[PDB]
Ligand binder design. Structure first.
Ligand SMILES: OCCn1cc(Br)cn1
Length: 119
C-alpha cells in the first residue's frame, strides 16, 4: 500500500527500456532534419528521455500519467510509419509489448494503494 512506490518502479522500468535495443529510435526526440514533415503528421512528439526527465523533475503525479506519455511514443510511431512492416514500427510493437507487460503491476499496486488510503 505504498502510494509513492510507483516512482522508483518506473525509474527501473525506464532503465530496462533504455538497455533494450528496440528502444534506440525512441530514446531522444525524432530528428526533424531527418524527418522534415514529422510535425505535419504528429501533433505531440514524445520520447523516453522526455519521459525520464519529466519523472525526475517530479512532474508526474501518478504512473497513469507516465503510461499516457509512453503510449504516445508508440501511437506516434504507428501514425508516422509508411508501412506496418517498417523497421522502426516493428521495434515499437515489441517494445510496447515489453512495456505493457511490466507496467501492469505498477498501475495495479498504485491504484490499490490509493483505494486503501481513501478506505
Ligand atoms: O523513430 C521515430 C520516428 N518514426 C519513424 C517511423 Br517509421 C515512425 N516514427
Amino acid at each position: 500500500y505504498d502510494i509513492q512506490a510507483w516512482k522508483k518502479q518506473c525509474e527501473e522500468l525506464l532503465n530496462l527500456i533504455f538497455q533494450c535495443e528496440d528502444s534506440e529510435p525512441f530514446r531522444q526526440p525524432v530528428d526533424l532534419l531527418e524527418y522534415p514533415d514529422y510535425r505535419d503528421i504528429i501533433d505531440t512528439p514524445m520520447d523516453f528521455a522526455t519521459v525520464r526527465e519529466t519523472l525526475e523533475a517530479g512532474n508526474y503525479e501518478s504512473p497513469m500519467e507516465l503510461c499516457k506519455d509512453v503510449r504516445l511514443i508508440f501511437s506516434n510511431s504507428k501514425a508516422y510509419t509508411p508501412s506496418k512492416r517498417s523497421r522502426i514500427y516493428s521495434m515499437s510493437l515489441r517494445l510496447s509489448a515489453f512495456f505493457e507487460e511490466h507496467i501492469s503491476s505498477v498501475l495495479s499496486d498504485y491504484k490499490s494503494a490509493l483505494r486503501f488510503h481513501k478506505r
